[PDB]
Amino acid sequence: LGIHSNDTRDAWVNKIAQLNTLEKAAEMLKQFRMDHTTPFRNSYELDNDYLWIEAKLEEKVAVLKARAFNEVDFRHKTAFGEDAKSVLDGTVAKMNAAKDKWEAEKIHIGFRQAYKPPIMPVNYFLDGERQLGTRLMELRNLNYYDTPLEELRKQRGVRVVH
Amino acid sequence: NRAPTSVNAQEVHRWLQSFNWDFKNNRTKYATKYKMANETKEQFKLIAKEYARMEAVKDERQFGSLQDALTRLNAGVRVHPKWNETMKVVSNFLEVGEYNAIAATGMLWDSAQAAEQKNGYLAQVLDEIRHTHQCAYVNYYFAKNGQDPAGHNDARRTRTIGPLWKGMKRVFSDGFISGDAVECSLNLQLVGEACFTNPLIVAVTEWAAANGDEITPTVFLSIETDELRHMANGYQTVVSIANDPASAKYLNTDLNNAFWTQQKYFTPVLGMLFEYGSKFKVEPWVKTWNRWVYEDWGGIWIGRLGKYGVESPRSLKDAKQDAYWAHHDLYLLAYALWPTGFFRLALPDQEEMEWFEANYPGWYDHYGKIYEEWRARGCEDPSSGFIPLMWFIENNHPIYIDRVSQVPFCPSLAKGASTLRVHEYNGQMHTFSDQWGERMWLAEPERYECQNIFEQYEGRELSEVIAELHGLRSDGKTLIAQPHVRGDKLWTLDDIKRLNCVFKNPVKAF
Amino acid sequence: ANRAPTSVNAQEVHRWLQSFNWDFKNNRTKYATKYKMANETKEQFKLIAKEYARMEAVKDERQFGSLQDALTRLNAGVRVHPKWNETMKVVSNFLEVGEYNAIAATGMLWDSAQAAEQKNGYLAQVLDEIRHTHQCAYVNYYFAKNGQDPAGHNDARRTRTIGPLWKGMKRVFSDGFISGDAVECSLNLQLVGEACFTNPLIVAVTEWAAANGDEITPTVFLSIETDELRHMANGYQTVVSIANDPASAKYLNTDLNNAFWTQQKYFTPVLGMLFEYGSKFKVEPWVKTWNRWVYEDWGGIWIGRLGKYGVESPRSLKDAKQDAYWAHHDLYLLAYALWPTGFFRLALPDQEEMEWFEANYPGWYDHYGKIYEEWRARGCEDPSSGFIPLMWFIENNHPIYIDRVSQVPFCPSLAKGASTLRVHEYNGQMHTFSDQWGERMWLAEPERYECQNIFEQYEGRELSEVIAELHGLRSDGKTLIAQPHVRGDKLWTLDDIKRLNCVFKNPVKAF
Amino acid sequence: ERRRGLTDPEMAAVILKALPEAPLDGNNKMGYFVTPRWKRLTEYEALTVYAQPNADWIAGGLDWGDWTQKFHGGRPSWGNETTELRTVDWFKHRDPLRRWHAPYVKDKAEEWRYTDRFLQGYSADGQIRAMNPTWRDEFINRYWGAFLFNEYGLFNAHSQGAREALSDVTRVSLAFWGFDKIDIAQMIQLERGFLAKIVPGFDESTAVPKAEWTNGEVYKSARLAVEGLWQEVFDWNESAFSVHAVYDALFGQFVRREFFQRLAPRFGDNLTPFFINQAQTYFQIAKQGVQDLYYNCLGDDPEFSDYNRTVMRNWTGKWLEPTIAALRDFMGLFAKLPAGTTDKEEITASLYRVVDDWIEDYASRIDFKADRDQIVKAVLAGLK
Amino acid sequence: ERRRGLTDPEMAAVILKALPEAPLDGNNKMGYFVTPRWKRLTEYEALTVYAQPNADWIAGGLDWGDWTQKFHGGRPSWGNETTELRTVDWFKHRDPLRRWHAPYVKDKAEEWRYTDRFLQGYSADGQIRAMNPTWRDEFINRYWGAFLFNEYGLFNAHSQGAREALSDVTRVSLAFWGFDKIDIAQMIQLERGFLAKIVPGFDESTAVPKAEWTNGEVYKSARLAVEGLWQEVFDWNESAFSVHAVYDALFGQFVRREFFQRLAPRFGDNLTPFFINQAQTYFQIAKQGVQDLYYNCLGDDPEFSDYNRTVMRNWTGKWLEPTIAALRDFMGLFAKLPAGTTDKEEITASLYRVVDDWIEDYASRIDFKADRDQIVKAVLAGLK
Ligand SMILES: [Fe+3]
Ligand SMILES: [Fe+3]
Ligand SMILES: [Fe+3]
C-alpha cells in the first residue's frame, strides 16, 4: 500500500515492461482506457492508480510508435495505422449528426477512450477536442435547469442509495 | 536640431487592433459555445514595455518595504501565532488561484479575436505570474523570518494531505481552466475575482493588520492595485460575447454554475479562515458575506451587466440560505481532521466563544459544547490519545466529501445545510451535499471523477499517510499540523500512530 | 548565433583608468596647498560612473520603497516622541549642510589629486555627498509632510539662520570642509569629521531614533552609512598620497590637530546635548560614548593605523578630554536660555530625566537641575510669565559670549567645564575666546576668522523683531516655531516675546 | 482609527505574549525540498517550482488523484495528451536567466525608459537628417513595418502554451518568450510612430505595412509559415520549439540581423538598429531558455532522450520547408534595394552565417542532419 | 535585544501619551518658501534649493554674516569673486529634467544594465563578424579610443565648478554634467575592452589611443583646447559655459555625430553607435540644463542680462578659435579612411549641420554674431 508507490503500480510497471511491439502496446493501452478510465469504465478496481498506469502505458506506446513510424506516419497516423484526419473527420460528422446530448456524450467519451494520444497524433486529437467539445457543450447546456432532478436522475440511470 | 520627442504607450496602442489579420484558420483552439466579437476594445491602452514599467514601480515599492524596514521591525515574527497559521493557507491557496489564472487568461487570450482584447488578456497573464510570485513570496518571507516556517516552507507538497486543498483546487484551479473559455472567464473574472478574490484580498489585509502582520498588507495591497484591469477584462469578455445568440442561450447557466462553484467553497472556507484563524476579529462573516455577495456583487456589479443579458444567479438565494452556519460546520470538520493539514489549528478560547455567541446566537449550545467536550477529552494534549475524528465515529456522524465541490460535510451534525444524496452509477457511489452540484454531476458525470481523501486513504493508518506525504517537521517526528498554536507539547507522528486511526470510506455503509 | 555571451564589468574598465590622465605643463592643482598629492596613487574601490550608479540605485530603491509604502502605512512619521521630532529637525538639517559642503570639499579634493584613480575616488564621494544631502533633506521633507510638527522640518534652511548653534555648525561642517588647504579640508572632512564623529554619529542617531519611535531616520541613515567605507578609504588615500612629500613631516600633524580641535569643539557639547537633552529614552551617557568614539575608536585604532605615515595623535586630545565632561550640559543651559532664536522646540529635563542625569553625571543636579528648577518656577514654559532664561543670565551677571573662532556660545562665570575667557581688542574690534587653541588660530590667522556673532548682528534689536524678520514663525503668522516645551498647548507667540522686551546686547562692549 | 497589532500597545502586548520562545522549525528555507539546478536554491526556484498543482501521473507532479473538474468529455485540466514530448519530470527546466516576474519586468522597464531617453535625444539631435529618404519611406515604413505582423503571429503561437504548459517553469518561460515577441512588434510600431512625429508626411498607419504583409510577395511564405505555426499547431511544445528553434532562428534571424540590422546602417538609419538591438537581445535571451527546455531537459531526458529527439527532428523537418520557403520569398527584397547596396557575395555570406548559427545552436543538439549548402542554395534560388 | 519605540508596547504607550492631538502646524510642505519654477513645487526643488548656506551678499542667499572660517589670506568659502557672471539670485536655475540624485542614478543604472544585456546579446549573436576589420583596428582602437581623453579632460574641467558653484542647483547640475562626461570616457574604454574580449588579438591597452591623443596630429588642437579649458580657466562659469556651449557643442558634436555616428555604420559597426547614442543622450540632457543656467537665468537676468551676454560673447569669441582649430585638425582624419567612404559634399553638409545647430542652440541666445560660412571655411581648410 502507498499513495505514490504500491504493489498495483509495481505489477503494472512490470506488465508494461514486457511489451515489445507497438501493436500489442497500443492494444493494451486501448483496452486499459476502456476498462479503467471514464465514468463508463468497466470497473472501478483501479480508481486510485489508473491515471499513473495509463501515463506509463502511454510512454511505452509513444516510444514504440516513434521507433516504428516514419516522419510522415508519426505526424499523420494513429498507432493502429489509421489516418488520423479521416478518423477525426468521421467522428466530427457523427457528432454533428447527434440528436441529443446523450448520444453526443457517448461519441465524445468514446473518441477520447479510443484515440487519446499516443494513439492519435496530438494535433489531430486536440482539433477533435475543440470541435466535439463545442458540440457536446452546446447540446448539454441548453435548457440546463428545465429537467427536474427526478427526471434527470431517471435519464442518467442512477440508482438512489440515499 | 529639433524638439525632444518620444512615443507613449497610447500612441502605439492606437494601431494594435490592426495587428491581427484575416486567414482561414484564425480561430480559437478551444471548444466554446460562444464567439467573441473581433472588434472588442480594451479599456487600458497598455503595451508590454509600459506594463513592465508600471509593474516595476510597484515591485520596487513592495520589495523595498519588505527587505529594509519590515525586516528591521522584525515584522515577520511579531504576528499572532494563529494568524501566522492562517497565512500559510491563505497565501498558498491564493497562489494556486493566481497560478491557474495565468493558464486561464492564456486560454482567454487564445479565445479573443480582437487584438485589443488579446492584449488585455495578455496583461492579465503577466499579472497572474506577478501575483503567483507575490503570494509565493509571502510564504517565503514567513518561512525565512517567521515564528513557525513549517507549512510556509513546504506548502506546495504538504497541502496535498488534507481535504480543504481539494475544494480549493476545484474553485481556483480546475474551475479556472477546465471547460468553456467563457465559463472559465466567469469563474475567474466575473465571479471569482469580482465576487470574492478582490474583497478577500482587501479584507485579508485588514485582518493581517489587526493581527500584527505587516507583510501580507505590503504584498496584497500591491496585488490589489492590478485588479481594475482584470475587472475590465471580465467585463469586456461579457461585452464581446453579448451580440451572439449563444450568449442568450447559455450565459446565465454558465454564470450560475460559476457562482455556485465559487461560493460553495468560499462561503465556508473564508469565514472559517477569518473567524477561527485570527485572534483579533475585524467583522463577523455573516455581514461580510452579505455585503460581498448580495450587495457588492449580486446587486451592483451584476446589475451593471443587465444590458448584456446577465441576470443574478438563480442559486443566490440558496447560497444565502446555506451560508449562515457553513463556516462553523466546516471548522468543526477541519479541526476534527487537524492531523491532515499543514497548519496549526486552535480551539476557540473563552473570549472567542463569547464573541461567537454574541455574533451567532445559538453558536455555543452546538459548537461550543462540542469544542468543550473535545477539550476535556484532551484534543490538544498529545498523550490523550484522542483525535476529534474519533468523536465523529463514536457519535455516528459520518463525514462525507461532496463529489463535485470536494467540500467535507457532516449532514447529521451541520446546523446549516444537512442534505445527503448518495447515488450509485456503474459500480461506484457518489455523495452530494446540494442540488446544484448533484445536477452538475448528472449533466456531465465525466467532468467530476476526483477521488476524495477517504477513497484515496481507505484502509490506511493516519500516521502512514502523514509520513508518506511529508507532513513532518524538520526534526522528522513532530507533525506540521497541530491541534493548538502553543510552542510546547506538540504532537508527534508517534502520538498519531498510537491512536491507530484508519481511514474508512463513508459511502461503504450504503 | 556564434559566440559566448560576454560583457565587461567595472573592474576591467577601471584597470585602465590610471592612464586616462596625461602630462602637460599646466596639469596642476588650482588651489593653494602645502602638500603634493603623488600620482600613481591608487583607490581601494574599482568603480566607474555607471557601476556606481547601479549600486547606489539599488540602495535608493530599497530605502524609498520602505518610506513610501510600509512606514507610511504604519504612521511611522507621527508615532515618534515629540522631543525626538524636535531633535530630528536639527540633526537632519545640520547633517544636510555637512553633506552638501562635503560635496564641494570632495570637488576641491578631486581638483587636488593628480592620479586619475584618486580623482575617481574623490568623484564617487562627490556623488555620494549629493546623495547624502538629498537623503537628509528627504528626512526633513518626510517629517514635514507626515510628522507631528512640520514647523522647523519645512523651513529649516532659512530658519536655522536665527540661532547661535547654526554658526558653529557652519564652522565645523561648512567652512572647515572647504576653506583652507585641500589636505586640511580632507583632514576636517574625512580623517576627523567622518572617521571620528560623523560615521559613529549616524549609527548612534539610528539607535536613539529607534528607541524613540522613529523609523524614518534609521531607514535613511543606515543607507547613508553604507557609503562611508569608501569615504574612509578616500581620507586614508589622501594621507597616503602626501606621505612621501617632505611637506608632510612639516605640516600634517599641525593640520590634523587644528582639524580635530575644530570638529571636537562643536561636536563635544552639541552632540551630547542633542542626544541626552533631545530624547525621552536614553541609549547611553554621552561621556562614555565620547570616550569610546574619540579616545578609543578614533585616537586609537584609526589614528594608530595612520601612524605609519607620520600621523601622530592630536596634541589637543588631552585638553579635549578634559573639557568634554560638562560641555554639553553647559551648552544646553545656554541653548535653552536662548530658545526663541531656535527653529526647534526644547524641553526642560523632567524628574526621571533629572534622575538619569544625576545617576550618570554626579553633581549634575545641584548645578544644572537647580537652575532648571528655578527657571521652571519662574514660568519659563508659561507664555504669560514674561520670563526668558536669558533674563536670568542678565540678572545674575552671567554674560554669554560667542567664541570668535568656533562660534560656540559659552558662559565662563557658570560653566562646570572650561570656564576660560580671553578678550583682546585688535584694530578697533574686540574678540572673545574660550580656549587657547582657537585663540592661537585667530592670532596666527586673524583674516580667516571674521564671523559676526548673533550679539553683534542683533545688537540693539528687540528679540521679537529679529524673530519676525528672519521668519521664525509658524504658518499661523503669530506663534513661534521655537518653544520652551514640547506640549501641544500654551505655545508662545511673537506677542509674548514682544512683551518680554528682550533687547540683544553685545557682551564685549562691557570691556 | 485603525489599530495595528504591530504598533498598538495592547494588541502588541497580547501578540508578544502568545509568541513562542524560538521558531518552531529550524528549517526556514521555503522550497527546501526542491532540487537546485545550481549550487544552492535560488529565489527564482523557491518562488516558481511546484506552483502548478500536478498529480504524479503528470511526470514530476507532487499531488495525487485526478483533477476535481475536467472539460466536457473528460479532457483533464492538464494532461500528458497535450504534447508529444515525454519526460520524467516536467519541473526540471530552469530559465538560465532565472527570471521570475520581478527581474523580468525590471529589465523590460529599464529598456522602456532607456528607449524614451534615446528617442528624445535622437529627435533633439536631429539625427534623422542623415537617413536616406527612400530607405525610410519604402523599407522602414513598408517592409520593416510588415515584419511586425510576423512578430505578432509568433507572439500568438504562444497562447496555447500559456494554457497547456505542464509545469510552472515551462509556463513562465513560455509566457516571457511570447511577451518578448509582442514587445518587438510594438517596438516596430513605435519606431513607425516616432518617424511620423519627426518626419512630416510619414504615415504611422499600419495599412501600408499590413497590405505588404497580407498581399505582398516578399512576405507571402513567411505569413503562410506564421499562420501555420500559430493556428495549425496544437502541441504547445511543437509550437514553442518550432517557433524558436526553427522558424525564428532562421527566418527572423536573417531578416532582423542579416537584412535590416545590416543594411540600415548603410542608409544613415541608426534608428532601426536601435530597436533591432533590443530584438536581438530578446532572441539571445530566449535562446538560452529554449535550449534548456528542449535540449538539456527533454532532448537529454534520461528515459526519453531518444524518443524526444526523434520528435524534435520530426518537427524540424516539418517546419524547415516553410521556413526555407519564407527565406526564399524574402530573398526578393534585395532586388528592390538601390543598386550597389549589397552583392550576391554578401547575401550568400549572411545566409551562411544564419544557417551555421542555426546548425551550431539548434540542429546539431538533436542530431538533425542539415545540409548548410543545400539550405543556402534553396534560399538563394529566390535571389537570382 | 533592542526595543523599538514604534513597536514596543511600553515605550509606544509613553510616546502615544506625549503626542499632540493634531499636528502643531498645518504647513506640511518642506520647501514652501521656495519660488517654484513650474506650477507646484517639486521634490527636486524641495530637496535641492537652499541647501547651500549662502549669506545674502551672495545673490539670492538667505543667511546673514561672513563665513565662519575663510582661506588663508582672507578668501571667502564662496564668493562673487570666483566668476565674472552676475545675477540677482544664484538659486534661480532649475534643471529642466529635475534631476536630483535618485532619478539621476536610477537612469544611469538603467543604462548600465541595458548596456550589459546588449553586450551579452551582441557577443552571443556574433554581430562582430560583419564589422570591417580595418575600421575596428584603426578607427575604433586608435581614434575613437583617443577621443576618450578629450572626454576625460572635459570631465576634469568640472572640478573647479564643483568646488565653486554659488548655489546648490548650479552645483548639482555641474556635477551631473561632469559625471556624464567621465561616464562617456569610461564607456569608450569599455567598448575597447569588449572588443578585446570578443576579437582575438585586439589590444585594450590605452597605449595606442593615448599616443594618438598626446602626440598625434588629428587630435592635437583638440588636446590643446581641452588642456586650456581644464587647467587655464579659473572661472567656474567660464569653464562650464565654454566646455558645453562652445567646445563640446561644435567639436565634440562633430566628432561623435558627424564622424563616428555617421561612418561607423558604413563599416558594419553597430557597436560604436550603441555607445554614441548614450553620449548623445547625455549631451542633449546637459544642453537643456546649460541653456537654462546660461540663457534662461544668467543671460536673461533682469538686471545683468546685458553684462552677462557681453561676458558670454567674450568667452565664445575666446574659445571659438581653439574649437575651430580642433575641428580643422580633426579634418585630417578623413584622409585615412578608405577611398569612397565620404566626399567633400557630405563632410561639408555635416559641418553645416553642426554649425547651424550650434548657432541655433547657443550662439544666437547671446546675440553672438557667428558666420556659418566663415566657420565652415576655416574648418574645411584642413580637409587634406
Ligand atoms: Fe491575481
Ligand atoms: Fe486579478
Ligand atoms: Fe556624506
The amino acid at residue B403 is R
Q: What are phi and psi of C433, to 5 degrees?
A: -130, 150
**Residue A51 and residue A3 share a domain:** yes
Chain C residues with CB under 8 Å of E64 CB are 161, 452, 457
Quick check: B439 and A152 CB within 8 A? Answer: yes
Q: Helix, strand, coil % (nearest 5) of chain E?
A: 65, 0, 35
Nearest to B480 by CA among B161, B153, B150, B156: B150
H or E stretch covering B409: strand B408-409
Residue pointed to by grid coordinates 523557491: D46
Nearest CA in chain D to B46: D186
Taking alpha carbons only, the member of E113, E58, E52 closest to residue E82 is E58
Alpha carbon distance D22, D25 (integer Å): 9
Q: Which three cell numbers stand for residue C486?
A: 514640547
Residues in chain C: 511
Three-class SS state of C71: helix
Distances (CA, A) of D18 to B80, B147, B484: 7, 11, 12
Alpha-carbon separation of residue D106 from B286, C59, D128, D177, E313 (angstroms): 42, 15, 30, 16, 46
How many CB atoms within 10 Å of residue D201?
6
Interface residues of A toward B, Cβ cutoff 8 Å, are 1-4, 38-41, 43-44, 47-48, 105, 109, 126-127, 129-134, 136-138, 140-142, 144-145, 149, 152-153, 156-162
Residue A154 lies in a domain: no
Q: Which residue is associated with the grid cell 460553495?
A: B264
Are the C-beta atoms of residues A14 and A60 closer than 8 Å to each other? no
Per the listing, cell 445568440 goes with: B245
For strand B429-432 and strand B400-401, is the pairing parallel, antiparallel, or unpaired? Answer: unpaired
Rounded to an integer, what distance in angstroms lies between the CA atom of residue D73 and that of residue A130?
Answer: 11
The contacts found for D45-48 with CB under 8 angstroms, 24 or more apart, are D45/D94, D45/D98, D46/B136, D46/B140, D47/B132, D47/B133, D47/B136, D47/B137, D47/B140, D47/D100, D48/B133, D48/B136, D48/D100, D48/D168, D48/D169, D48/D172
**Phi, psi of D125, deg, nearest 5:** -75, -15
Residue ranges making up the domain that contains A86: 69-141
**Residue partners of C484: CB distance under 8 A and separation at least 6:** C336, C339, C345, C346, C347, C348, C380, C381, C492
Ligand having the closest approach to the CA of B100: 1
Contacts of E35 by beta carbon, 8 Å cutoff, 6+ apart: none
Instruction: Tell me the backbone φ, ψ of residue B507, rounded to 5 degrees.
Output: -75, -20
Give residue C247's domain range.
1-511
Contact D356 C2 (CB under 8 A): yes
Of C37, C151, C177, nearest to C97 by C-alpha is: C177
Chain mean position to CA B352 = 24
C-alpha cell at C37: 598629492
Tell me, yes or no, whether A152 lies in a domain.
Answer: no
Cα-to-centroid distance, B234 and ligand 2 (Å): 10
Distance B178 CA to ligand 1 centre (A): 18
Nearest CA in chain C to B205: C73
Go through B463-473 and write b for each residue having 16 or more CB atoms within 10 A of its CB, e for each that does not.
Answer: bbbbbbbebbb
Least Cα separation, residue C69 to chain B (angstroms): 6
- Rg, chain E, Cα only: 25
Q: What is the resolution of this structure in A?
A: 2.4
Report how far residue C310's alpha carbon sits from residue C244's, in angstroms, rounded to the nearest whole number: 10
Flag whether residue E129 sits within 8 Å of chain D, measured between CB atoms.
yes
CB B123 within 8 Å of CB B232: no
Q: Is B227 annotated as a binding residue?
A: yes
Position A43, amino acid: S
User: Any idea of the CA torsion for D83, D86, D91, D95, to the nearest 10 degrees?
Assistant: -70
E7 and B78 in contact (C-beta within 8 Å)?
Answer: yes
Per the CB < 8 A criterion, the answer to whether E157 and C40 are in contact is no
Q: Which residues 216-255 in chain D show a CB within 8 A of chain B?
A: 223, 227, 231-232, 234
Amino acid at B366: H
Which residue is associated with the grid cell 576627523? C192
Helix axes C216-225, C116-146, angle to 10 degrees: 180
Amino acid of residue C506: N
Residues forming beta bridges with residue C503, ordered by sequence position:
C462
Residues of chain D with C-beta less than 8 angstroms from the C-beta of A58: 80-81
User: Residue type for D322, please?
Assistant: P
Are residue A37 and residue A50 in the same domain, yes or no?
A: yes
Tell me how far CA of residue D159 lies from CA of B104, B106, C14, in angstroms.
10, 5, 46
**Residues B136, B134: Cα–Cα separation, whole Å:** 5
Report residue C343: phi and psi, to 5°: -120, 25
> How much of chain D is helix, strand and coil, in % rounded to 5?
65, 0, 35
> Rounded to an integer, what distance in angstroms lies between the CA atom of residue B94 and that of residue D192?
42
* CB contact (8 A) between residue B154 and residue D23: no
User: Rg of the Cα trace of chain B?
Assistant: 24
Give me B350's grid cell.
Answer: 473563552
Grid cell, residue E317, equals 569669441
Strand partners of residue D63 = D55
Q: Where are the domains of chain E?
A: 1-384
Asked if residue B459 lies in contact with residue B503, where contact means CB atoms within 8 angstroms, the answer is yes
Q: 3-state SS string over D131-196? A: CCHHHHHHHHHHHHHHHHHHHHHHHHCCHHHHHHCCCHHHHHHHHHHHHHHHHHHHHHHHHHHHHH
Distance (Å) from CA B197 to ligand 2 centroid: 8
Cα E242 from Cα E233, distance rounded (Å): 10
* B472: DSSP letter: B
Torsion angles phi and psi, residue B344, rounded to 5: -90, 135
Residues recorded for chain D:
384
Give me C80's grid cell. Answer: 515618534
CA atoms in the 13 A half-sphere facing the CB of D41: 16
**In which residue are the cell numbers 477546465 written?**
B178
- C427: which residues sit within 8 A by CB, 6+ positions away? none
The residue with cell 465525466 is: B446
Of D107, D125, D265, the CB nearest to E266: D265
Q: Contact A112/D74, CB-based, under 8 Å?
A: yes
Q: Which-ligand-closest: CA of C105?
A: 3
Domain tally for chain A?
2
The closest alpha carbon to E287, from E96, E146, E14, belongs to E96
Q: CB D68 to CB B174 under 8 A?
A: yes
Q: Kindly determine whether residue C66 and residue B62, on different chains, have CB atoms separated by under 8 Å.
A: no
DSSP class of D258: I
User: How far apart are alpha carbons D70 and A108 in whole angstroms?
Assistant: 13
In a domain, A146, yes or no: no
Domains contained in chain C, number: 1
* Rounded Cα–Cα distance for residues D321 and D310 (Å): 18
Among left, alpha and beta (phi > 0; psi -120 to 50; other), residue C492 is: beta
Which chains are adjacent to chain C, needing at least 3 Cβ pairs under 8 Å?
Answer: B, D, E
Q: State the method.
A: cryo-EM
CB B464 within 8 A of CB A78: no
Chains with 3 or more CB pairs closer than 8 angstroms to D?
A, B, C, E
Distance CA D325, CA D314 (A): 18
CA dihedral E260, E263, E269, E271 (to 10 degrees): 20
Active site residue C451: no
CB nearest A132 (choices: D57, D73, D311): D73
